[PDB]
Each structure stands twice: as C-alpha cells, then as structure tokens.
Design a protein around this motif. Sequence first.
Motif, PDB file in Angstrom:
ATOM      1  N   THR A   1     -43.145  66.165  30.380  1.00 10.20           N
ATOM      2  CA  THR A   1     -43.420  64.735  30.428  1.00 10.20           C
ATOM      3  C   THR A   1     -42.125  63.938  30.581  1.00 10.20           C
ATOM      4  N   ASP A   2     -42.272  62.651  30.881  1.00 10.82           N
ATOM      5  CA  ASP A   2     -41.151  61.744  31.103  1.00 10.82           C
ATOM      6  C   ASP A   2     -41.421  60.451  30.336  1.00 10.82           C
ATOM      7  N   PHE A   3     -40.408  59.937  29.647  1.00  8.83           N
ATOM      8  CA  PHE A   3     -40.552  58.671  28.934  1.00  8.83           C
ATOM      9  C   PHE A   3     -39.643  57.577  29.476  1.00  8.83           C
ATOM     10  N   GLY A   4     -39.185  57.749  30.710  1.00  6.88           N
ATOM     11  CA  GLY A   4     -38.468  56.679  31.377  1.00  6.88           C
ATOM     12  C   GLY A   4     -37.097  57.052  31.911  1.00  6.88           C
TER      13      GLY A   4
ATOM     14  N   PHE B   1     -39.144  52.992  24.643  1.00  7.34           N
ATOM     15  CA  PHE B   1     -39.923  52.832  25.867  1.00  7.34           C
ATOM     16  C   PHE B   1     -41.147  51.947  25.645  1.00  7.34           C
TER      17      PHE B   1
ATOM     18  N   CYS C   1     -46.428  67.914  21.238  1.00 10.34           N
ATOM     19  CA  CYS C   1     -45.219  68.440  21.860  1.00 10.34           C
ATOM     20  C   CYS C   1     -44.984  69.900  21.492  1.00 10.34           C
TER      21      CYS C   1
ATOM     22  N   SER D   1     -44.261  56.118  19.210  1.00  5.83           N
ATOM     23  CA  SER D   1     -43.559  54.995  19.818  1.00  5.83           C
ATOM     24  C   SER D   1     -42.065  55.265  19.962  1.00  5.83           C
TER      25      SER D   1
ATOM     26  N   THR E   1     -45.097  52.131  23.388  1.00  4.79           N
ATOM     27  CA  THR E   1     -46.008  52.826  22.485  1.00  4.79           C
ATOM     28  C   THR E   1     -46.993  53.704  23.252  1.00  4.79           C
ATOM     29  N   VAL E   2     -47.256  54.900  22.731  1.00  2.19           N
ATOM     30  CA  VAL E   2     -48.260  55.788  23.317  1.00  2.19           C
ATOM     31  C   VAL E   2     -49.495  55.843  22.426  1.00  2.19           C
TER      32      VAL E   2
ATOM     33  N   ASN F   1     -39.999  67.216  24.837  1.00  2.00           N
ATOM     34  CA  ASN F   1     -40.544  66.538  26.010  1.00  2.00           C
ATOM     35  C   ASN F   1     -41.344  67.470  26.915  1.00  2.00           C
TER      36      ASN F   1
ATOM     37  N   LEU G   1     -45.815  49.868  27.911  1.00  2.38           N
ATOM     38  CA  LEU G   1     -44.364  49.777  27.979  1.00  2.38           C
ATOM     39  C   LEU G   1     -43.868  48.513  27.295  1.00  2.38           C
TER      40      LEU G   1
ATOM     41  N   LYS H   1     -49.738  54.751  27.688  1.00  2.05           N
ATOM     42  CA  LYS H   1     -48.409  54.260  27.353  1.00  2.05           C
ATOM     43  C   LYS H   1     -48.300  52.790  27.714  1.00  2.05           C
TER      44      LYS H   1
END
Length: 300
Positions: free
Chosen positions: A155-158, A24, A98, A21, A26-27, A143, A48, A46
């Motif tokens: 990857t992208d988290f926002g 952004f 990761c 988490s 929680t995954v 990432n 948001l 994910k």
Amino acid sequence: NQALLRILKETEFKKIKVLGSGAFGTVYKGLWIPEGEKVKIPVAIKELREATSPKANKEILDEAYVMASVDNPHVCRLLGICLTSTVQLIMQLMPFGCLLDYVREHKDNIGSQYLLNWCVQIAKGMNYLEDRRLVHRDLAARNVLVKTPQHVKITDFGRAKLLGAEEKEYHAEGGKVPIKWMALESILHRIYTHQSDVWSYGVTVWELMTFGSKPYDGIPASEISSILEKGERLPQPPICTIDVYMIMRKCWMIDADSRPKFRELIIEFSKMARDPQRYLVIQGDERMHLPSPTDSNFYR
Ligand SMILES: *CCC(=O)Nc1cccc(Oc2nc(Nc3cnn(C)c3)nc3[nH]ccc23)c1
C-alpha cells in the motif's frame, strides 16, 4: 476488466469506523453501495487531510486516474474517489491489517512457505510498480497489508512518486523520513530510485524473517548513515540460510546498481519458495498452521 477509476457520490458509501490515522489523513472501514447495482462492498476509505494549497479537482482527478490504473495482485488498488469538501479515496479493504502486526501476532504459527511466498509477492508488486515508473519510497512491513494469510498487497500513504519517461531519480524535499528503511543515497541526498526501493525491500524481508523485529533496535536514527558507511548491516536472522541472507545483503550494497533488480528477486525467491524448508530453518515448521480455506477438508 481494465482497472478504471470510479467517481462516487456521498450517497454511495459510508464510513463505519476509524481504522487509523496519520499526517496523510484518516483511514476508515466502510461500505460501498454503488448506485443502481444492488451490491454491498466492504472498503477502506482514506479521507485526506486538508492541505495549505489544495489541488484543483482537475489535478486530483488526473492523479487519481493514474492511481486507479495501478492493477496488480500485490498492490492495494484504488477503486474510486469522491471529491467534496475533502478528498476521499475508496480502496480495497485488507481484512487482516498490516503484515508487520500480523507476523508479530502469529509468529508461533508462521512457517517457511508463508514467509517465502510473501517475499515473492512483495517483489512482484514492486516489479510492477517499477514497470509503471512508480518509486514507492516507503516500503516496510508496516506498509504491506494482508488480504488473506496467503495473499498480501503493498500500500501507499502518499510518499510514492511517478517518474517521467526520462527521469531515473526522484529528488525529495525536507521532512520526516523512515531512516532505518532507507538507502544511503536517500538518507544523505534525498535521492530515490527503484534501486533505493530495493534497499527497503531487503529491510522488509529482514523484518519478516525476524518475525517483526525492529531494525537497528535501540540505535538513534541520526547514527544510521554513520554505521552504514562503516559497512555495518542488519544481522543474519537465525532462521535464514546463508543463501537467503546473501540476497538481503546484496540489497544493501552502497552502489545502487550493484543491488538486485526486482525482476531478479522474483526469480530467486520463487526458486526458494518452491522448496521452502531448504532455505529457511524453523523449528516445528512442518507442524505450523495458519487459517486456510482447506481446513475443513483436512479436519484442521
Ligand atoms: C502495521 C501498520 C498498520 O497498523 N497499518 C494500518 C492501520 C490502520 C489502517 C490502515 O490502512 C488500511 N487498513 C486496511 N485494513 C485493516 C484491517 N485492520 N486494520 C487495523 C486495518 N485496509 C486498507 N486498505 C487500504 C488502506 C488500508 C493501515
């Protein structure tokens, strides 16, 4: 065929357990069971966090269709979306987590071929993002995710942003930023470009080549712009030949246009990955082994 966004109902997937988490949201590790299709697909979900000003569903779907169109072997793909009280993004699950943690955990068995292949793959993914006019703004080993030891995905988290056809820069606002991965112009002026992503690529490569060392360890983030302006940079990793370190140093030039382009990084690291032991010197390299589908064939 062509990557298309799927719209999911809550009946078609399940969150199994939390993976992590952040700000952004929680995954979750999850399962996608598309209606009528008789298939079960492991996914990352994910959910948001609720925003003060939630986007309208139309706004969200427009962004999601663009996100879903991002289709490259080295970028983690958005497979579907479910809009209810929350926004849930259904992503490809990367089973091995990761790359930062992976290289720390497995460093005794990581040889030059893997390191250089990962560098190529990340450059290919970033070049694809640049072609799509996407500035990532948070490239780091944390990432990049691991599909298999042989195959990684950004990857992208926002933080990623889409530039307009005539925009060459993204101008950011306030907030927490990953200082030790950032180009000077981003630190000092909140300016982000594909060339500031190149700076971050160089730091990411340095992370891999040091098997997950922390950049500028022990140094306060507040002092980073100062040391960069003095001309100080991350040191040559012991396993790196001068040729490899010089590419990394070029990524950290003050003049953004003096830095390499991702297309050039693909070419250079591809050359090196073709003869890995010429370019990285690792003790016991030829003996090192990571889990491969060919292990049974060679009795490993
Ligand atoms: C080093 C950074 C890190 O630990 N990142 C991270 C933790 C938890 C979830 C997450 O997002 C995604 N994880 C996976 N797969 C995974 C396997 N084991 N872990 C701990 C995570 N796949 C994903 N696909 C899209 C997003 C994620 C990242």
